[PDB]
Amino acid sequence: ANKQQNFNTGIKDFDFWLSEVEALLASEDYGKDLASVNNLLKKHQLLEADISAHEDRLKDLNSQADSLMTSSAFDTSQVKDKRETINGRFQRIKSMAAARRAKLNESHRLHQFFRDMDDEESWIKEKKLLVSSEDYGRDLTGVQNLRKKHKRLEAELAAHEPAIQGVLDTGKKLSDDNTIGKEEIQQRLAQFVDHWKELKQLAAARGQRLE
Ligand SMILES: [K+]
């Protein structure tokens, strides 16, 4: 083939690839959990490696376009226009790829935060089961032994409160810096506070019943 035909073949292939990547990068799937965000991050790494491997494909197509544009044999305006368009599309793909990377990393941080919150909610739930006891002591000796167990539990809740505040502080930062949607973090933070207040209230009600 001549240089015109080789460029046209290369451009048909490059154009198809650009269309594929444009469609892939328009996905707003940020995942539902840490395992699915991790799969999206692996997928996105491979795509970014594919884009990187095409930046040299683009250099070659650019060199072909520049050689074609020196020709006196045909009107080179279609070559010039194609070169402009493949370059503009490629640069937009690099911008979309960086934006999707930032959102996937944000999503990973958010889902890791949710896992950290789940560990705290499991702690809360274990303690809530302890203070849900409706044994208030058969006698003076029996309530004295329950009152000493309950003061130890209240001291555990007070010593854990900095960890609960740390979850709220982290959640505020993530919410304020969020670009992918705050509906889930808002709901989870509210539900988390409800879980902590419920445990504190149930512990305080039980403590009053042991006096
Ligand atoms: K914990």
DSSP 109-173: HHHHHHHHHHHHHHHHHHHHHHHT-----SSHHHHHHHHHHHHHHHHHHHHHHHHHHHHHHHHHH
> Is 74 strand, coil or helix?
coil
Q: What's this structure's resolution in Å?
A: 2.0
Distance between CA atoms of residues 70 and 3, nearest Å: 12
Report whether 209 contacts 136 (CB < 8 A). Answer: yes
Measured CA to CA in angstroms, residue 13 lies from 20, 45, 75 at distances of 11, 22, 23
CA angle 191, 197, 150 (to 5 degrees): 135
What's the 119 CA to ligand 1 centre distance in angstroms?
A: 5
Q: Which residues surround ligand 1, an ion (CB under 5 A)?
A: 119, 123
Q: 205: burial class by Cβ within 10 Å (0-12, 13-18, 19+)?
A: exposed
Distance between CA atoms of residues 76 and 72, nearest Å: 9
Measured CA to CA in angstroms, residue 180 lies from 25, 149, 175, 192 at distances of 15, 45, 10, 21
Q: What letter does residue 1 receive in the DSSP assignment?
A: -
Full set of structural domains in the chain with CATH: 1-108 (1.20.58.60), 109-211 (1.20.58.60)
What's the 75 CA to ligand 1 centre distance in angstroms?
A: 71
What's the 57 CA to ligand 1 centre distance in angstroms?
A: 51
What's the 123 CA to ligand 1 centre distance in angstroms?
A: 6
